[PDB]
């Protein structure tokens, strides 16, 4: 008969709204008691009478789900629903602790709340009943103790009711009457917030606009309290950033920066949070990261600091200038952030950024020589913008070489901090050399020569565009250096980049031989570069299977010579992974 | 191609090559005795049959061993007895003279073809025959 009544519900829509409201009115007239319970509360209730009431709430749920647009709603059905919900609350909170009929009437009450939320799920902007405050005060006096009750990952009876009441136009009258956002913000600022906290945050972010478009001054102060909740909930959207739904945070922070500027410490906290929005997770997308940096700039245009947020915005621009993502949109937002950071370093940054980012002109090569002849003492964002131009951004090749040489000149004129800046230059040149670049690899080689300012002739002859006598002199220089972990790793990386699967050129056997000779000359340095030799042999072993295995086989055979010389010298090690790699070679032998 | 379980090649045959002249020479040069009966006990029907041949007393010993071993008398199964007992006793009185069967001397069956002249150790190399001697 459940399947039969489900068929009756699936065919219970064929009659008009008059007959649907008449059948709903007959369903309401079972145990309404509007003479007894339309004033305040009910007169009496029973277990089987609540079972008629639980069945009435279930029939209301089935009727609303069947006719989930119109539902034939009536104030008699509303009064019967309020009488049933109040009788469920009264019986559950007035019965003794025996829990059988109490859990029956509690699962009657949760299902009745689900059927009540179904009415607003079906007929939301259709009725908007003007006597809402009766049921609103009834449900408030029932669920006053539901302060932090709806704070969970699945608690969505009163949380969904609050979201429905907040996502309307004029049904927020019961919200702005006394309180909805107070208890919602209490459970939102609860510290054990699960991932419905983002749902409540998006609901309040969408519901601040109705409280702002409302002409009532009470709703204006409630919108002020929603901005105050956005300022007092400065840990929830931080700690709940476990998914890629950071567009809600970027949509609230832009709304907050466009709406309310209430404290300089609040603007500094917003700028530091949007700095953590780019220094917290690397999976933030382009529009979200651009709007987050623009919201940090919008808080900084109002109430920024002069030293602390100055350095924070300078670090933000020093990351965003190395990024420059999304076809110069992030570069334009980074130039705006550097012009809003309000320092002397930021002033030189905005000058040397606007003088180069003038919409694809020769002003980039003009401004590189301009700041070279007029070298600025900030130099951090200058080295960022001149190392993005030294990377695979095609123009400013000689200007990139002059920028690296001028950074070396400043690092020699310092004579400590600018040597740690040269450490960052070397840690950038390492990832530049281990890459598929053509102009930026030559620029990193020029930076290696400027850091080297026999060895200088070797570097300039490795970057000589000749490659036959040049590679012969490189092999002879490796022989002279044989007769350095990261340094020889960088040299062998540049050599492997110049001979990296370029099988349209000859002497690849001597090129791999020079790679293995530099690897042997690094592996002779056992006290330092044994780890680097192990890493280079490991990367060559990964390349021995990664889609190409002709010259990598000879690289494996000639990197075995370091092991042969080490075993002849030993005449303790790690035999285990060596034997397992021997088993892997035996498996590659059965290919 | 592929393997196929062959009981006819891991079954104990040992009878294609069992020749009575070779077996008699082995019994002569055996240097361990032969379990012969007390002399009257092996004649059969008061002399109406033969004595009994060596294969017949071997088969009789096997039948009595199986007999005592699983407690069952053998039977008078008609088709097998009308073949084997009558044909066996008629060739017994044909060829068994005084407890000795002379049927083989009247039978064409080459000794060296099947039972001598080893097939696995054929030694078809001068080096293999040299290593087989030394």
């Amino acid at each position: 008969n459940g399947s039969q009544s489900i068929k009756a519900e699936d065919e219970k829509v064929v009659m008009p709204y008059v007959l649907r409201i008449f059948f709903g009115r007959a369903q309401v007239p079972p145990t309404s008691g509007q003479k007894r319970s339309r004033k305040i509360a009910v007169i009496s209730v029973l277990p089987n009478f609540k079972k008629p009431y639980i069945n009435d709430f279930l029939s209301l749920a089935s009727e609303r789900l069947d006719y989930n647009y119109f539902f034939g709603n009536s104030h008699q059905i509303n009064s019967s629903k309020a009488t049933l919900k109040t009788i469920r609350r009264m019986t559950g909170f007035v019965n003794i602790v025996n829990s059988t009929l109490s859990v029956l009437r509690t699962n009657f009450p949760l299902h009745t709340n689900s059927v009540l939320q179904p009415l607003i799920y079906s007929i939301a902007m259709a009725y908007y009943v003007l006597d809402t405050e009766s049921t609103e005060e009834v449900h408030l006096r029932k669920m006053a103790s539901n302060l932090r009750q709806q704070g969970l990952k699945c608690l969505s009876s009163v949380f969904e009711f609050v979201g429905n009441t907040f996502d309307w136009s004029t049904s927020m009258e019961d919200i702005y009457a006394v309180v909805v956002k107070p208890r919602i913000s209490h459970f939102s600022d609860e510290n054990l917030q699960q991932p419905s906290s983002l749902l409540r945050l998006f609901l309040y972010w969408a519901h601040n606009p109705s409280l702002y478009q409302f002409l009532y001054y009470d709703e204006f102060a409630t919108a002020t309290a929603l901005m105050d909740t956005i300022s007092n909930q400065h840990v929830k959207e931080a700690v709940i950033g476990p998914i890629i739904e950071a567009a809600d945070s970027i949509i609230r922070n832009p709304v907050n920066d466009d709406h309310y500027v209430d404290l300089v410490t609040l603007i500094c906290t917003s700028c530091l949070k949007i700095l953590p929005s780019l220094y917290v997770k690397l999976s933030d997308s382009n529009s979200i990261s651009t709007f987050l940096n623009l919201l940090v700039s919008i808080t900084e245009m109002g109430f920024i600091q002069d030293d602390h947020v100055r350095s924070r915005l300078i670090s933000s621009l020093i990351s965003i200038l190395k990024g420059k993502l999304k076809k110069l949109q992030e570069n334009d937002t980074q130039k705006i952030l550097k012009i809003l950071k309000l320092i002397v370093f930021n002033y030189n940054c905005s000058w040397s950024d606007i003088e180069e980012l003038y919409t694809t002109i020769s002003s980039l090569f003009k401004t590189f020589d301009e700041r070279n002849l007029r070298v600025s003492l900030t130099e951090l964002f200058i080295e960022l913008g001149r190392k993005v131009p030294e990377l695979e951004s095609i123009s400013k090749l000689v200007a990139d070489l002059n920028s690296y040489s001028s950074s070396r000149m400043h690092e020699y004129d310092f004579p400590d901090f600018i040597n740690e800046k040269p450490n960052l230059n070397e840690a950038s040149k390492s990832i530049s050399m281990l890459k598929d670049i053509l102009l930026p690899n030559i620029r990193i080689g020029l930076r290696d020569s400027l850091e080297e300012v026999v060895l200088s002739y070797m570097v300039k002859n490795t970057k000589y565009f000749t490659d036959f006598e040049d590679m012969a002199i490189l092999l002879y220089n490796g022989d002279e250096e044989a007769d350095r972990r990261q340094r020889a790793i960088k040299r062998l990386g540049e050599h492997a980049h110049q001979l990296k699967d370029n099988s349209i050129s000859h002497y690849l056997i001597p090129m791999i031989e020079h790679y293995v000779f530099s690897d042997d000359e690094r592996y002779r340095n056992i006290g330092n570069e044994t780890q680097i030799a192990i890493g280079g042999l490991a990367q060559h072993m990964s390349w021995n299977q990664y889609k190409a295995l002709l010259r990598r086989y000879i690289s494996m055979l000639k990197t075995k010579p370091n092991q042969m010389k080490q075993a002849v010298q030993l005449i303790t090690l790690r035999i285990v992974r060596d034997g397992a790699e021997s088993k892997l070679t035996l498996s590659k032998f059965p290919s | 191609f592929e393997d196929r379980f062959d009981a006819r090649e891991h079954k104990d045959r040992s009878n294609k090559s069992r020749m009575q002249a070779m077996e008699e020479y082995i019994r002569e040069s055996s240097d361990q005795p032969d379990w012969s009966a007390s002399i009257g006990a092996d004649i059969v029907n008061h002399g109406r049959g033969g004595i009994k041949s060596l294969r017949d007393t071997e088969k009789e010993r096997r039948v009595t061993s199986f007999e005592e071993d699983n407690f069952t008398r053998l039977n008078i199964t008609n088709k097998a007895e009308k073949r084997k007992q009558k044909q066996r006793e008629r060739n017994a009185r044909m060829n068994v003279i005084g407890g000795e069967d002379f049927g083989i001397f009247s039978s064409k069956r080459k000794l060296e073809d099947s039972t001598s002249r080893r097939g696995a150790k054929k030694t078809r190399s001068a080096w293999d025959r040299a290593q087989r001697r030394l």
């Binding site: 829509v13 006719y67 989930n68 647009y69 | -």
Partner: protein, 166 residues
Amino acid sequence: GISRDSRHKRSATGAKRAQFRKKRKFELGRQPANTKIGAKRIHSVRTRGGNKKYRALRIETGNFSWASEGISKKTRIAGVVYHPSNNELVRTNTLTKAAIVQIDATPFRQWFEAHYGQTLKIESSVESQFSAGRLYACISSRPGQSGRCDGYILEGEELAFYLRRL
């Protein structure tokens, strides 16, 4: 039907002199029950133990599926206009699998007006049938084997995929 065996016919080599055998039980070809529109009558035939098979002949209540949301709802049958597994099958107006048949789409109107409010994002050449009532939909289920008429609606790409044909 007759058979399922290669013995009555020639292979990829061209052989003759067949004269093979009395045909067995397990070459059982039943009669082709061309399912039509009528009053719902399904023959419950037996095979392979208690393997009842529903052979539908006059089925109506097609469960056809709204595609973009996957809403299989109940409707009637009108007629198949194009099915060149037999071009006389559409002349005789039967109902087999993978046929494109017409449906009075009034419960789909009810579901759209029930879970969207207003009446009429969806394509225009099926919005014309949203207005008129008869929409094209293709049968998925097998009434000759499973006895049922299920199907999927035509929505856009598959619609024009058949409308350019016929």
